């Protein structure tokens, strides 16, 4: 995972977004949404989804939200007041901590001004705090912008490292939830929905010579009288029940 001063973003698109797979990562610590319900995630289809990941202290997890301020919110990772999406965080001590302290995770402490939403700054340029140029010499009122966390096994709650993932949820949509389905019943009389084609009647064997690109057929009155089963690709002849 990336340091908070240099958070890592990747784009998500053209996929089936199963949001149940991420509830088996770790016990449970922080989870909150915004503009979306946790139980409607496996349904809504999004135009764009972005995953922003980083490592921070447990006590800093509260800063990753709309309307927050402190250190991380202002100098490392800022969310917009109208942020839409879900934030997931869990305790990663067992993987990230070290006996003398893991010093490979950095955050920005010295900064001229607050960051904009989803802005990043990867610069390590010397910060001038005073009214005189130090020309690179780290003396008085002259600082290296970044500091380390030094995560240790001996630290209590709030000082331990947490892995944070922010899923930003945003026209034609490409990131859709999964669909459920049941068994196919033949030669009876059922209600049915075939990949969006709703209707009622008896489903029987068909001898209609469908072309490779055709999904359903119609009678002389332009009414659907046959469908292709989306899983078996078989053709079902549809008639009214006796």
């Amino acid at each position, epitope marked *: 995972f990336a340091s908070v001063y240099a958070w890592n973003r990747k784009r998500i698109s053209n996929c089936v977004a199963d949001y149940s797979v991420l509830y088996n990562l770790a016990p449970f610590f922080t989870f909150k949404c915004y503009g979306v319900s946790p139980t409607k995630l496996n349904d809504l289809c999004f135009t764009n989804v972005y995953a922003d990941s980083f490592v921070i202290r447990g006590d800093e997890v509260r800063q990753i939200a709309p309307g927050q301020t402190g250190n991380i919110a202002d100098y490392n990772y800022k969310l917009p007041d109208d942020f839409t999406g879900c934030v997931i965080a869990w305790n990663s001590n*067992k*993987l990230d901590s070290k*006996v*003398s302290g893991n010093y490979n995770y950095l955050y920005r402490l010295f900064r001229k001004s607050n960051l904009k939403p989803f802005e990043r700054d990867i610069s390590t340029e010397i910060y001038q705090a005073g009214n005189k140029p130090c020309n690179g010499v780290a003396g008085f009122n002259c600082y290296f912008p970044l500091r380390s966390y030094s995560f*240790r096994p*001996t630290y*209590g709650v709030g000082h331990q490292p947490y892995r944070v993932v922010v899923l930003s949820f945003e026209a034609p949509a490409t990131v859709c939830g999964p669909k459920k389905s049941t068994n196919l019943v033949k030669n009876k009389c059922v209600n049915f929905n075939f990949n969006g084609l709703k209707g009622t009647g008896v489903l029987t064997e068909s001898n209609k010579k469908f072309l490779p690109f055709q999904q359903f057929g119609r009678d002389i009155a332009d009414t659907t009288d046959a469908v292709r089963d989306p899983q078996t690709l078989e053709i079902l002849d549809i008639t009214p029940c006796s």
Partner: antibody
Amino acid sequence: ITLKESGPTLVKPTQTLTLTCTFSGFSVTTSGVGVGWIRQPPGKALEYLALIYWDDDKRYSTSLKSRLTITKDTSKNQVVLTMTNMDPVDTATYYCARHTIPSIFDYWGQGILVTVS
Amino acid sequence: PVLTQPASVSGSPGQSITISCTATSSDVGNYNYVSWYQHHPGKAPKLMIYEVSNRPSGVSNRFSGSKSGNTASLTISGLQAEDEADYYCSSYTSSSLLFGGGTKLTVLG
């Protein structure tokens, strides 16, 4: 998961002891996993010597920090610990073991007995 | 900054005994990563309990543990003659890891 130890069993005073741990069944280059060394002198408890992490971060016992050096070769699955300026009192059985956070050491090897004389 | 243990523990077979290990410093912090070992002479040390109370695979359910404050305890129920070994505790400190003095177990009979 197995770890085998080999090296000198007899060392002269002021000389350097080099022990090699060869492991298999796992990779060291993974998060949360390291390899360390522990020794047990006669009549005494286990003493921590050194630990090397998957990212080559090298840590040592504070009392032996200046005497121990630990390195690893990920191509042969081997970890090597060298201890300089061996004293007549540095007689112990050395052990190679896997280091994790929820469990400080596990999968301990049988160990190698080193005597200084 | 030393882990302190009793010189030995003893009791009748079939009964329960306790092996204790107490920290003497605040360098241990949360002291929530206590490991216990059963060392059989001539063999490698074996991990019996980790993270205070959890068992590794290949370990009998007769072995368990707990914590109170900055002191840890190893509980051995249904004591067997096969449990005669030197037991050790281990925990993290601010810049290193330590092992305890070691407790010698004796089974009466």
